[PDB]
Amino acid sequence: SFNANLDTLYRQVIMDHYKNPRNKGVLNDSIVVDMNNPTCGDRIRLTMKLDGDIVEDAKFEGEGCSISMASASMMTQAIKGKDIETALSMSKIFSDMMQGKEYDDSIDLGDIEALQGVSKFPARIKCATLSWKALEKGVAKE
Ligand SMILES: [Zn+2]
């Protein structure tokens, strides 16, 4: 069916980020945040190189389900070059998309919109948010 094909296309984007992750590794001279989601057993180490308040670079290492690792990939791709304020606005928009609301759709959220499917399964919301919590934890360390 058509809804099925659209779901499959979304899923193919998510699997592209899971099997072709962006920004894998660990940055030198960076903020390091470790974060884990015991409710799925996902763990991530996010590093961020900030130029003042500009996300100059962001990498992650980790192990978890397709959702958490794909979300980390999409987040690192989406926030690079943005200021902290914009990254946090993107985090709030993503949270709203996760909660099922009408999120702000006039700022570059890139690949992240494929993760809207996950609002359908509440238990998987934690997977999708792991990286963003690390991001927030990262930038509340100034
Ligand atoms: Zn998970």
3-state secondary structure of 50: strand
Q: How far is the CA of 33 from the centre of ligand 1 (A)?
A: 18
Way the structure was solved: X-ray
State this model's resolution in angstroms: 2.6
Q: Which domain holds residue 136?
A: 1-142
Q: From the CA of 64, how far away is ligand 1's center (Å)?
A: 5
Domain count, the chain: 1
**CA-based R_g, the chain, Å:** 14
Q: How far apart are the first and last CA of the chain?
A: 49
d(CA 80, CA 139): 14
Q: Is 34 annotated as a binding residue?
A: no
With vertex at residue 71, the alpha carbon angle to CA 62 and CA 37, rounded to the nearest 5 degrees, is 55
**Contact indicator for 55, 90 with CB cutoff of 8 Å:** no
Torsion angle defined by CA atoms of residues 111, 18, 60 and 86, in that order, rounded to the nearest 10 degrees: 10
d(CA 15, CA 11): 6
Buried b (16+ CB within 10 A) or exposed e, 35-45: bbbeebebbbb
Q: How many CB atoms are closer than 10 A to CB 46?
A: 29
Which token pair is 89? 């606005």
The neighbour count for residue 133, using CB atoms within 10 Å, is 17
Query: 51 CA distance to ligand 1 centroid (A)?
Result: 31
Q: What is the CATH number of the domain that holds 141?
A: 3.90.1010.10
